[PDB]
Enzyme design. Structure first.
Site, mmCIF file in Angstrom:
data_model
loop_
_atom_site.group_PDB
_atom_site.id
_atom_site.type_symbol
_atom_site.label_atom_id
_atom_site.label_comp_id
_atom_site.label_asym_id
_atom_site.label_seq_id
_atom_site.Cartn_x
_atom_site.Cartn_y
_atom_site.Cartn_z
ATOM 1 C CG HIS A 74 33.784 -22.700 -3.505
ATOM 2 N ND1 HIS A 74 34.073 -21.760 -2.545
ATOM 3 C CD2 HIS A 74 32.817 -22.158 -4.283
ATOM 4 C CE1 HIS A 74 33.319 -20.691 -2.730
ATOM 5 N NE2 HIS A 74 32.545 -20.909 -3.780
ATOM 6 C CD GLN B 187 23.589 -4.135 -23.089
ATOM 7 O OE1 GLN B 187 22.743 -5.036 -23.228
ATOM 8 N NE2 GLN B 187 23.416 -3.108 -22.257
ATOM 9 C CG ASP C 95 37.168 -21.740 -0.827
ATOM 10 O OD1 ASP C 95 37.535 -22.267 -1.897
ATOM 11 O OD2 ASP C 95 36.009 -21.345 -0.619
ATOM 12 N N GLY D 188 27.713 -16.517 -6.966
ATOM 13 C CA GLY D 188 28.301 -15.906 -8.147
ATOM 14 C C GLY D 188 29.359 -14.868 -7.793
ATOM 15 C CB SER E 41 32.111 -17.967 -5.089
ATOM 16 O OG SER E 41 31.226 -18.401 -4.125
ATOM 17 N N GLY E 42 34.959 -16.348 -4.823
ATOM 18 C CA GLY E 42 36.250 -16.167 -5.463
ATOM 19 C C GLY E 42 36.696 -14.738 -5.733
HETATM 20 C C1 LIG Z 1 29.812 -18.445 -4.438
HETATM 21 O O1 LIG Z 1 29.450 -17.371 -5.220
HETATM 22 C C2 LIG Z 1 29.020 -18.434 -3.132
HETATM 23 N N1 LIG Z 1 29.675 -19.394 -2.219
HETATM 24 C C3 LIG Z 1 29.014 -20.410 -1.664
HETATM 25 O O2 LIG Z 1 27.807 -20.598 -1.766
HETATM 26 C C4 LIG Z 1 29.895 -21.290 -0.779
HETATM 27 N N2 LIG Z 1 29.098 -22.198 0.054
HETATM 28 C C5 LIG Z 1 28.392 -21.689 1.151
HETATM 29 O O3 LIG Z 1 28.298 -20.477 1.363
HETATM 30 C C6 LIG Z 1 27.793 -22.685 2.048
HETATM 31 N N3 LIG Z 1 27.126 -22.186 3.198
HETATM 32 S S1 LIG Z 1 27.323 -22.798 4.693
HETATM 33 C C7 LIG Z 1 28.982 -22.537 5.093
HETATM 34 O O4 LIG Z 1 27.124 -24.179 4.606
HETATM 35 O O5 LIG Z 1 26.546 -22.025 5.567
HETATM 36 C C8 LIG Z 1 27.932 -23.989 1.723
HETATM 37 N N4 LIG Z 1 28.551 -24.425 0.567
HETATM 38 C C9 LIG Z 1 29.094 -23.562 -0.260
HETATM 39 C C10 LIG Z 1 29.739 -24.129 -1.492
HETATM 40 C C11 LIG Z 1 30.688 -25.147 -1.362
HETATM 41 C C12 LIG Z 1 31.233 -25.743 -2.470
HETATM 42 C C13 LIG Z 1 30.879 -25.287 -3.734
HETATM 43 N N5 LIG Z 1 31.553 -25.782 -4.876
HETATM 44 C C14 LIG Z 1 29.888 -24.313 -3.885
HETATM 45 C C15 LIG Z 1 29.299 -23.762 -2.777
HETATM 46 C C16 LIG Z 1 28.696 -17.103 -2.417
HETATM 47 C C17 LIG Z 1 27.589 -17.242 -1.394
HETATM 48 C C18 LIG Z 1 29.904 -16.416 -1.813
HETATM 49 C C19 LIG Z 1 29.564 -19.727 -5.285
HETATM 50 F F1 LIG Z 1 29.890 -20.845 -4.649
HETATM 51 F F2 LIG Z 1 28.293 -19.849 -5.622
HETATM 52 F F3 LIG Z 1 30.246 -19.749 -6.418
HETATM 53 NA NA NA Z 2 30.622 -6.841 -21.354
#
Ligand SMILES: *[C@](=O)([C]([N]C(=O)[C]N1C(=O)C([N]S([C])(=O)=O)=[C]N=C1C1=[C][C]=C([N])[C]=[C]1)[C]([C])[C])C(F)(F)F
Ligand code: NA
Length: 240
Positions: free
Chosen positions: A45, A64, A93, A186, A188-189
């Site tokens: 994602h 920095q 994912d 942020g 994520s991944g």
């Molecule tokens: C991550 O840094 C971020 N991940 C997400 O926000 C992933 N995500 C969710 O947590 C939900 N919550 S839920 C399962 O519906 O309760 C829903 N959608 C997403 C999601 C899906 C697809 C994409 N491209 C982005 C977000 C952290 C919370 C771990 C991110 F996504 F922001 F980069």
């Molecule tokens: Na840096």
């Protein structure tokens, strides 16, 4: 990372910052784990869009210049074939990024150690989430790498009704849920580092949290279970 503390600059050398180009600038969007000198593992994602990306290894302070960074472009992106754009709940994912250049390993840049296939951790195993994600629900990104102690919640408890129910599958790892610490936008991944046999191994790729809030009690951060994907990872690396 919510409820976290700043990490030492040499504690988690496999952590990377995945950035996309906005205008003429670059913006951090996700974490990742260096698995080969030219391969990065992250969440699907994160690289689901036709954006221009780059990886920063040896990073500590997003704003920095630490004097330790290496900026490398992404040559190719292999998302898991079963990944479904909307569905973070369906699983799969995970994605691999071949870097345009092999990075140089030193004490700020090292390869992450992956677990043996099928490895499942006992409940309440000691793990740490790392990242530059939001430090508070609807807050802002951290400038410096944060870390938080997030012990595992085994599948049986995590998939129960008071937690995530059917939303969580066996190909995922649950960690935290105390209402104080968690991953957040942020992060994520990025990696879930777990102490196993006196060694820290990357057991998860940060996937999702409660849509209602990052640090929600009984809504642990959910990760893609890396050990369920050892064959895929090796096949991708071996093939292209
Ligand atoms: C991550 O840094 C971020 N991940 C997400 O926000 C992933 N995500 C969710 O947590 C939900 N919550 S839920 C399962 O519906 O309760 C829903 N959608 C997403 C999601 C899906 C697809 C994409 N491209 C982005 C977000 C952290 C919370 C771990 C991110 F996504 F922001 F980069
Ligand atoms: Na840096």
């Amino acid at each position: 990372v919510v409820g976290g503390t700043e990490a030492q600059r040499n504690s988690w050398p496999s952590q990377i910052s995945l950035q996309y180009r906005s205008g003429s600038s670059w913006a951090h969007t996700c974490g990742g784990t260096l698995i080969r000198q030219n391969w990065v593992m992250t969440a699907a994602h994160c690289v689901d869009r036709e954006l221009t990306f780059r990886v920063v290894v040896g990073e500590h302070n997003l704003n920095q210049n630490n004097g330790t960074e290496q900026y490398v472009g992404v040559q190719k992106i292999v998302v898991h074939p079963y990944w479904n754009t909307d569905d973070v709940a369906a699983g799969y994912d995970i994605a691999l990024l071949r870097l345009a250049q092999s990075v140089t390993l030193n004490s700020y840049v090292q390869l992450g150690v992956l677990p043996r296939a099928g490895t499942i951790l006992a409940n309440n195993s000691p793990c740490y989430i790392t990242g530059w994600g939001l430090t508070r629900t609807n807050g802002q990104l951290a400038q410096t790498l944060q870390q938080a102690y997030l012990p595992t919640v085994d599948y049986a408890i995590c998939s129960s009704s008071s937690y995530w129910g059917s939303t969580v599958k066996n190909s995922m790892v649950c960690a935290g849920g105390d209402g104080v610490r968690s991953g957040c936008q942020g992060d994520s991944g990025g990696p879930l580092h777990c102490l196993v046999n006196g060694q820290y191994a990357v057991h998860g790729v940060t996937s999702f949290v409660s849509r209602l809030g990052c640090n929600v009690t009984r809504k642990p951060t959910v990760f893609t279970r890396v050990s369920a994907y050892i064959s895929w990872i090796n096949n991708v690396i071996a093939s292209n």
